[PDB]
Design an enzyme around this catalytic site. Structure first.
Site, PDB file in Angstrom:
ATOM      1  N   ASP A 127       0.783  -1.211   0.000  1.00  0.00           N
ATOM      2  CA  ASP A 127       0.000   0.000   0.000  1.00  0.00           C
ATOM      3  C   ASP A 127       0.828   1.281   0.000  1.00  0.00           C
ATOM      4  O   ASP A 127       1.308   1.682   1.052  1.00  0.00           O
ATOM      5  CB  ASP A 127      -0.905  -0.061   1.240  1.00  0.00           C
ATOM      6  CG  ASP A 127      -1.920   1.035   1.380  1.00  0.00           C
ATOM      7  OD1 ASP A 127      -2.024   1.869   0.462  1.00  0.00           O
ATOM      8  OD2 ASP A 127      -2.619   1.057   2.406  1.00  0.00           O
ATOM      9  N   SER A 147      -1.590  16.063 -11.714  1.00  0.00           N
ATOM     10  CA  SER A 147      -1.836  15.665 -13.089  1.00  0.00           C
ATOM     11  C   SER A 147      -2.166  16.918 -13.892  1.00  0.00           C
ATOM     12  O   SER A 147      -2.799  17.854 -13.384  1.00  0.00           O
ATOM     13  CB  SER A 147      -2.952  14.623 -13.165  1.00  0.00           C
ATOM     14  OG  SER A 147      -3.289  14.370 -14.521  1.00  0.00           O
TER      15      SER A 147
HETATM   16  N1  LIG Z   1      -6.138   1.186   1.715  1.00  0.00           N
HETATM   17  C1  LIG Z   1      -5.852   0.209   2.746  1.00  0.00           C
HETATM   18  C2  LIG Z   1      -6.769  -0.996   2.598  1.00  0.00           C
HETATM   19  C3  LIG Z   1      -6.291  -2.126   1.963  1.00  0.00           C
HETATM   20  C4  LIG Z   1      -7.109  -3.230   1.823  1.00  0.00           C
HETATM   21  C5  LIG Z   1      -8.399  -3.208   2.307  1.00  0.00           C
HETATM   22  C6  LIG Z   1      -9.259  -4.451   2.112  1.00  0.00           C
HETATM   23  F1  LIG Z   1      -9.303  -4.755   0.781  1.00  0.00           F
HETATM   24  F2  LIG Z   1      -8.677  -5.492   2.781  1.00  0.00           F
HETATM   25  F3  LIG Z   1     -10.529  -4.234   2.581  1.00  0.00           F
HETATM   26  C7  LIG Z   1      -8.879  -2.079   2.950  1.00  0.00           C
HETATM   27  C8  LIG Z   1      -8.062  -0.968   3.097  1.00  0.00           C
END
Ligand SMILES: NCc1ccc(C(F)(F)F)cc1
EC number: 3.4.23.22
Length: 330
Positions: free
Chosen positions: A35, A199
């Site tokens: 992430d 952008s």
């Molecule tokens: N942006 C962070 C994040 C990553 C994955 C998820 C999920 F897919 F596991 F719900 C939620 C939030």
């Protein structure tokens, strides 16, 4: 040194991407969601509430010879979608695609929200935004990228996400065979702790390019493309039958419609997102209404260049003293 790891979509819709990560001695392999919108490396563990675990692989620090409790340290994080997690902190050896970091803060989740529990394929997150966003207190911890920086040949990492297919995360080098043409670099503001950039505009299908400044973040951890209401309404106005639905909480379109491409500007270059990448399939099994991959950022407060946008390009996250973002067609 360098690192190279394959990332794979968790489902048929590319809702998220998982990359195998080795934690501890001997190695415990967990599939983490990389992430670039967060800065915490958190995992499901032997300490997570038994009822809050549904099929995930867990990190067991008692079975790792290199694991040490980071005495007193705690963490608590809340994501933009509403999901959240918290627990205690350990330090341990973490390896991604051959690249090893010793003494990496591994945040052990004692509690997780339902959003994570129901996601059996994702064992945790590996945060790649700036370390200033890390939630560990009282002592803020560094990201994997931050800790690896000294040993990397080049202080960069690249994301080359696939459309309904595996992709690659490279650390320390730029693979000159993964893209076509040149890479266009653009300035990054680290004021909010994100890979934030501007952008230079956009186009819908084969329409004329509208030069306008759109500030947004490069976020591998967000599935969709979230842009200002003006831009999103101009895109959906070109799809017959499309509409914003309150029931669904976003734009929906007839499953039989063909979607135009969406182009975004990077300096003087153009990145074209094909129409097919904007199709997120039926809102429910058997429904004839499909969910759009381009949604409004009005309710969120920040524009997000998520997986929809990033998977159409070879993306360079240049973590030099003056950070930049590189974009190339592929
Ligand atoms: N942006 C962070 C994040 C990553 C994955 C998820 C999920 F897919 F596991 F719900 C939620 C939030």
């Amino acid at each position: 040194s360098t690192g190279s790891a394959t990332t794979t979509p968790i489902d048929s819709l590319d809702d998220a991407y998982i990359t195998p990560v080795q934690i501890g001695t001997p190695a415990q392999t967990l599939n983490l969601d990389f992430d670039t919108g967060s800065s915490d490396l958190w995992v499901f563990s032997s300490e997570t509430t038994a009822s809050e675990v549904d099929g995930q692989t867990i990190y067991t620090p008692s079975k790792s010879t290199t694991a040490k409790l980071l005495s007193g340290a705690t963490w608590s994080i809340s994501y933009g979608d509403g999901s959240s997690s918290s627990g205690d902190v350990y330090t341990d050896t973490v390896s991604v695609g051959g690249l090893t970091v010793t003494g990496q803060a591994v945040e052990s989740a004692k509690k997780v929200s339902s959003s994570f529990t129901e996601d059996s394929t994702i064992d945790g997150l590996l945060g790649l935004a700036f370390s200033t966003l890390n939630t560990v207190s009282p002592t803020q911890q560094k990201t994997f990228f931050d800790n690896a920086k000294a040993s990397l040949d080049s202080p960069v990492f690249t994301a080359d996400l696939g459309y309904h297919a595996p992709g690659t995360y490279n650390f320390g080098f730029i693979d000159t065979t993964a893209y076509t043409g040149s890479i266009t670099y653009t300035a990054v503001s680290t004021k909010q702790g994100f890979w934030e950039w501007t952008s230079t505009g956009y186009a819908v299908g084969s329409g004329t390019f509208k030069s306008t400044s759109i500030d947004g973040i490069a976020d591998t951890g967000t599935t969709l493309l979230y842009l200002p209401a003006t831009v999103v309404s101009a895109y959906w106005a070109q799809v017959s039958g499309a509409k914003s639905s309150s029931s669904v909480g976003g734009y929906v379109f007839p499953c039989s419609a063909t979607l135009p491409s969406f182009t975004f500007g990077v300096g003087s270059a153009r990145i074209v997102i094909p129409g097919d990448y904007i199709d997120f399939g039926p809102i429910s099994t058997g429904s004839s209404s499909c969910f759009g991959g381009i949604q409004s950022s009005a309710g969120i407060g920040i524009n997000i260049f998520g997986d929809v946008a990033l998977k159409a390009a070879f993306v360079v996250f240049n973590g030099a003293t003056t950070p930049t973002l590189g974009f190339a067609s592929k």
